[PDB]
Structures are given as structure tokens and as C-alpha cells.
Amino acid sequence: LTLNVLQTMNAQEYEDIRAAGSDERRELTHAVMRELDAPDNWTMNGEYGSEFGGFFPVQVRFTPAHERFHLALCSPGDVSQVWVLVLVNAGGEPFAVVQVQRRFASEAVSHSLALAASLDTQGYSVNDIIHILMAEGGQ
Amino acid sequence: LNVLQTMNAQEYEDIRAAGSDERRELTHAVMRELDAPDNWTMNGEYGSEFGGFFPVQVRFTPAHERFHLALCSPGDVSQVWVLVLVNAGGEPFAVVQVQRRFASEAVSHSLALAASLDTQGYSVNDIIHILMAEGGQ
């Protein structure tokens, strides 16, 4: 499971690995995470069962230490044809899709995360962080 | 009911954005149109305890908790209502039904069929394949 393999796989092929089993899915999740860089003092966690809702064959969450909000990277599958990066405030609002990608673009995700982090450190509100990330994300 | 059918994805997100009270009222209005099968519970997301992906998200769960279904509203993530079935452990999983416009009776019917098949001892894999046919997926 190289970066190129992760990029060429369609929505059904993501659902196919989830369908193959828990160990197969876990492998896929780790390969996605291996391509990503979590910002300093943030945690990065993948979903291995349905603890994150189970909606996406791969779901990776990135959370700042204070945990006021998180971002979730959601893979192609039955729900969405494209990779989706969302920002969710605790309590569900504000919320936005800040970026969509047709093909897995790893460096782009990590940069948006790096941007989210520094904006957070710099004391920007969640609303302002969403508005900025959407512009950075072409959204 | 008619307002729910008439609202586009962006109005769903505008209500969640307006505030927690406004979102709660929208969640309850959706839930009021639906019927949970006997011995199942129905719960709506009020914050981000179901992930917060959808302006309205309603979960339907049998008491045995081997699996559940979630109805997910239009918004940023999806232009359409989706009904998904999630097994314990995240697999098997499927979208069993998609709706461009909220069809409350069709959701309740799909849920009653899932409950019916489950009692009759169908595997979750088989319930998925059957509900997808019933749901037009």
C-alpha cells in the first residue's frame, strides 16, 4: 500500500478493504496515516471499528491538545466519492468541509493541519480558522 | 414535513450554524416524522457525540446493539439524505438508501424491514443486500 496505490484506488476499492476485515482495514488506515504529519502537540488517531461513526473506510482525526475542536480526514467510499477534510467544533458548531480531494493528496492535508495549528496557537477563533482553511483548501 | 423536503443542503447547514437551539428543533422535527421499530431506540445528535458530520443525524439501534442505522441529512458532506447500516466493529457497512428529498415514510419502512429481517434471523450481510434492493441502491 504505497502512496500511489492510495491515490489510484477508487471509492469501491476503499469499501472493499473495509469489507475484507478488521486487520485489512487497520493496515489501510496505517498506510494513510504514515503519509501524514500530525502537528506538534496534536494527536492523530484512526478509526479501527466504529468509534468515529464508521461512515468512511478510512477516517483519521487530528486533535489539538486542548481538544476544543478536531479535524477529520474522511476517505472515498459509499458515502463520498472524494476525500473530505472537515473541521468540527466540540458541540457540533461551527462545522465545515475545508477541503475536498479527488485523489489522496497527503502533503496538502498535512499543510492544512499545520496551518490550522499555527492559527490556533496564534489565537484565531474557530470561525476564522474555518474561513481561512476553506480559502487555503479551495473550498 | 414539507419544509424539510423543501430545504436544500445549505439551509440544513445554515440551521446548524444558527445555533444549538435551532439545530435541536430541526433534529426533533425530523425525528417526529419517523417511527422507530418496536424494541429499538431513536436518538438524534445534539452536539458532536455522533461525529458532527451532518446537520441532522438520527441513530436507530436495536436493544441487542449488534448493529445500528443512521440517517444523515444533506449539508456540506452530502447533497442527499443517506441511510447507512453500521455493524459492530465498522464492518459490514453500507449506504442502504439515498434520498434527494426527505421521505419520512420510506425511512420508517426501511427500518421496519431491517427489524423484521433481524428477528427472522438474517445475517447483517444479508440485511444489507436486502435493504439496498428495497432502498433502490
UniProtKB/Swiss-Prot annotation, chain A:
UniProt keyword Kinase, yes or no: no
Pfam families, A to Z: PsiB
UniProt KW keywords: Plasmid
Sections of the chain in a coiled coil: none
Signal peptide: none
Family, as annotated: To PsiB protein of plasmid R6-5.
Function field: In contrast to PsiB protein of plasmid R6-5, this protein is unable to prevent SOS induction for potentially two reasons: less activity and/or insufficient expression.
Cross-referenced NCBIfam families: PRK13701.1 (NF010255)
Entry protein name: Protein PsiB
